[PDB]
Design a protein around this ligand. Structure first.
Ligand code: MG
Ligand code: MG
Ligand code: MG
Ligand code: MG
Ligand code: MG
Ligand code: MG
Ligand code: MG
Ligand code: MG
Ligand code: MG
Ligand code: MG
Ligand code: MG
Ligand code: MG
Ligand code: MG
Ligand code: MG
Ligand code: MG
Ligand code: MG
Ligand code: MG
Ligand code: MG
Ligand code: MG
Ligand code: MG
Ligand code: MG
Ligand code: MG
Ligand code: MG
Ligand code: MG
Ligand code: MG
Ligand code: MG
Ligand code: MG
Ligand code: MG
Ligand code: MG
Ligand code: MG
Ligand code: MG
Lengths: 206, 51
RNA sequence: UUGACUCUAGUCUGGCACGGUGAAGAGACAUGAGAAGUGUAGAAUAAGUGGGAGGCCGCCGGUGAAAUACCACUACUCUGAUCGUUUUUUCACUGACCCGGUGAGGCGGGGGGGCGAGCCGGGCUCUCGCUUCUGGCGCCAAGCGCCCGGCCGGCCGGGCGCGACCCGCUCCGGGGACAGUGCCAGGUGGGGAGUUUGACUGGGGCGGUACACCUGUCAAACGGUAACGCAGGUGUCCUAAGGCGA
RNA sequence: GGUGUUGACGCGAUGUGAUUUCUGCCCAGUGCUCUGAAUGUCAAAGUGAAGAAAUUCAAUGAAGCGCGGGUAAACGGCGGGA
RNA sequence: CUAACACGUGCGCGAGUCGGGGGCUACGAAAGCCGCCGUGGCGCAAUGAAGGUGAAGGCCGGCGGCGCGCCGCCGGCCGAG
RNA sequence: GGCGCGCCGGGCCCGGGUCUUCCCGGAGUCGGGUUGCUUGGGAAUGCAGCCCAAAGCGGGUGGUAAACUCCAUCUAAGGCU
RNA sequence: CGCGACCUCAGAUCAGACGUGGCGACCCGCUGAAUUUAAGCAUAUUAGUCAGCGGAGGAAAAGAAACUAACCAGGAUUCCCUCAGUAACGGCGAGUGAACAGGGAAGAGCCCAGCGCCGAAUCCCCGCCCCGCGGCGGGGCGCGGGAAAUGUGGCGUACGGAAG
RNA sequence: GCCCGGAUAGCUCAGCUGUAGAGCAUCAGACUUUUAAUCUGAGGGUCCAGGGUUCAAGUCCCUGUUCGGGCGCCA
């Protein structure tokens, strides 16, 4: 793909701030259409994007953790929910799915994904709602920031994708760098390269 | 042959498009190159027809 | 010579190119527009993914559900119609191409003139354009009009236009994107070419196979031993008719 | 290019051989010819699919063969036993 | 008669051999010479289709290993039916 | 005749290294398909007819057809000696 | 209607030139068989040979890589030794059959179009004068004629090159 | 072999998110002289086996048998 056309698209959205003069918090997205990839056949792709800007930024987090996380999570204002809290969380499958409605993505400690599949592994894998693992580096400082914006390209049976990258107030070369990394990662993730797409559309939210 | 190939890329039957160029030009490497060049030309026409 | 073998000029047919221009008919599509997306629960006719918290003056929560709800531009499928890409069928066009005629001699429009139709001197529609009693002659301009030249109104001698209408892009016609040629492909092809047409054998030929094998003899008590010698046999059959044991 | 400085009362290809009297029967065979619409058969190219491609596979379907008429002054043929 | 091959025979050299092609110095277009002109041919190595591989062994000492008296490997010795 | 010397006239008023900025290529040809001939050239070595008929980090070659991918090596379709 | 530029196209016993034909041993282009061999014969073999046709020179053709290789890489063509009667082709039968690498003979490299930049800076022909003239050339003079912008000459060619 | 098509109760056939339907058959009841026929009703499938998408699929797609249909072989 040419890049001066992406410069044209980002100038037309930064001066299509004229086109809406948006009234909420502002963000854009890119859309992908693909040519003859049969969705019911094999080679189904589901890959995560390693991205270096966090284009969401209003990103909603609660974690699931063991101890060593208490004082640091409450110092950085992040909900540490230990196993007795998880018992109260496990006694009903109705409210635990509505806090995933509150909270955008999760992340959990190393051994608590042995206690989440009791009944509630299959209980709330009914959202596409993976809780991501931590490490023995034991730092959620900047690791929450770099595990958010690891964006899931997912193949489901409709033949269209739409991934939220870009809020219109970041800097422009770094945002086209984000779109650059995302689209070449998708072209690599597909069964075949850049010929496999129809048209990439980066129009705004409203 | 280029106009009929651009029209097959417009309808997007790319396999028969490639077989068409390779039967009417020759080597499959040349066919891949001419299909990719006509897709680029057709993309420029789509951008110009957009704005 | 042919019903031999292998081919061949020729001929028949198909495809590709030369090879265009329209118009209808049948379509495949694309593009633009316009409506459908009722298993069940949920106030609900939720097709699907993703973004999203006050647009405009429904919502975010909460409810049921697996999955939600202003917005936007997306990607799916289906249904009537308009447009531009291709295929195909038919009807036409002339411009490549072919044929005929001639000393390529009046072609196509338009103007002017006359004979017939009818409406109120008028125009339209159409036709015509000068030769038919005779084995004659038929060109190389008459007449008209306008200019000009030599000599003294007169002489003598020139030029131009009508007469013989004007304007045009193929000379006229006749075919025509097929005839045809170039190259493939299949058919046909003693018209023509090249070649072959076993062997044994009481001459060859016809017969027979004594040409590959088998039994008994011939075969003269080891083995070997001939002829178109004798009498016969074979080009198979067997899931047991093979192998064990009783 | 010949026929052709020609045009069916001609050109070209055949058989039989003046005249008189006749010219019987057979289209099964081999030819030749006529029509293209059932199952058929059928090349190259063109089309559709699968596959990474070479390639493979399928449908389409020309003539000719088949199939169905005609023809013996076409090659030819025209019984036996009680 | 030329070429190719085989065998026998004479000659030189002998695990080598050969300068035939090239070069250097009347008969002589002969003859000689090269050697860092042996490039090369043939020979000294066979087998396999090919990847390839590519032509004696033993005895002594130390460390059933167990129901490699064999020995896996190291140091010495004999050493080529 | 050539190699030598000299005079007059004429022609040319020429180079190299470093840095910077530019620029660069041969088409009914290459290539593919098919047919025919030819070659040792074998899933086609060369040549030609017909049809299709290009590209520019391209194109050709890389002795088994083909796809993906590194490399290697040249620069055809112009010419003299 | 005429006059004039150009473009196409004629005509000349126009001015000046040029090709024709011969020989053909060696060379180049095309065409191109069959006896023969295979114990027959049809593919092959004879054979890209004999015949045929065109065209040259003192030599012709070839030739300065769209190469050979796959290595520690060589480096135009031609010719010789060798590769080799090998790889390879072939009713895999008869028969056919190269090349690279190595050693030698010889040794030489270059030039356009394009990309460009220079006031077409270029070329041909007529006349006059001087010189030489049996290879019609050198210099000057021409308000002498043409060619050429539909592109001549200078630099410049893949080994890069040009300008400052 | 090969795209191709199928499997649904003892037997044939319809059917994108569940009471698997329609008929023929078997079982029982009533009429009957009697299940000889009539009529009433039932029961009766692990949707060929498994995997996948899906909110769950007998249906949509893969995998594997199994059979149906011509081409491939052969003469
Ligand atoms: Mg025959
Ligand atoms: Mg014949
Ligand atoms: Mg004959
Ligand atoms: Mg005989
Ligand atoms: Mg005896
Ligand atoms: Mg027995
Ligand atoms: Mg007769
Ligand atoms: Mg008959
Ligand atoms: Mg000897
Ligand atoms: Mg030839
Ligand atoms: Mg040959
Ligand atoms: Mg390779
Ligand atoms: Mg050159
Ligand atoms: Mg050259
Ligand atoms: Mg003259
Ligand atoms: Mg001559
Ligand atoms: Mg012979
Ligand atoms: Mg003989
Ligand atoms: Mg003979
Ligand atoms: Mg030959
Ligand atoms: Mg030969
Ligand atoms: Mg000759
Ligand atoms: Mg001479
Ligand atoms: Mg020469
Ligand atoms: Mg060169
Ligand atoms: Mg060489
Ligand atoms: Mg040898
Ligand atoms: Mg043989
Ligand atoms: Mg060499
Ligand atoms: Mg030397
Ligand atoms: Mg120049």
């Amino acid at each position: 793909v040419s890049r001066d056309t992406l410069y044209e698209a980002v100038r037309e959205v930064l001066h299509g701030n004229q086109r809406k003069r948006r009234k909420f918090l502002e963000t854009v997205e890119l859309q992908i259409s693909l040519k003859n990839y049969d969705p019911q056949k094999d080679k189904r792709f589901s890959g995560t994007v390693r991205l270096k800007s966090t284009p969401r930024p209003k990103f909603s987090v609660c974690v699931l953790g063991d101890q060593q996380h208490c004082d640091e999570a409450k110092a950085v204002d992040i909900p540490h929910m230990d196993i007795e809290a998880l018992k109260k969380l496990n006694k009903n499958k109705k409210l635990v799915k509505k806090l995933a409605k509150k909270y955008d993505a999760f992340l959990a400690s190393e051994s608590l994904i042995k206690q989440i599949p009791r009944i509630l592994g299959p209980g709330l894998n009914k959202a596409g709602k993976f809780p991501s693992l931590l490490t023995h580096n034991e730092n959620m400082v900047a690791k929450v920031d770099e595990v958010k914006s690891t964006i899931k390209f997912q193949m489901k049976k409709v033949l269209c994708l739409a991934v939220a990258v870009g809020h219109v107030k970041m800097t422009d070369d770094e945002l086209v760098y984000n779109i650059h990394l995302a689209v070449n990662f998708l072209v690599s993730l597909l069964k075949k390269n850049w010929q496999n797409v129809r048209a990439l559309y980066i129009k705004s939210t409203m | 042959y280029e106009r009929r190939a651009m029209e097959l890329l417009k309808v997007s039957k790319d396999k028969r498009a490639l077989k068409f160029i390779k039967k009417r030009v020759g080597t499959h490497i040349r066919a891949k190159r001419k299909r990719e060049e006509l897709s680029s030309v057709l993309a420029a026409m789509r951008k110009a027809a957009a704005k």
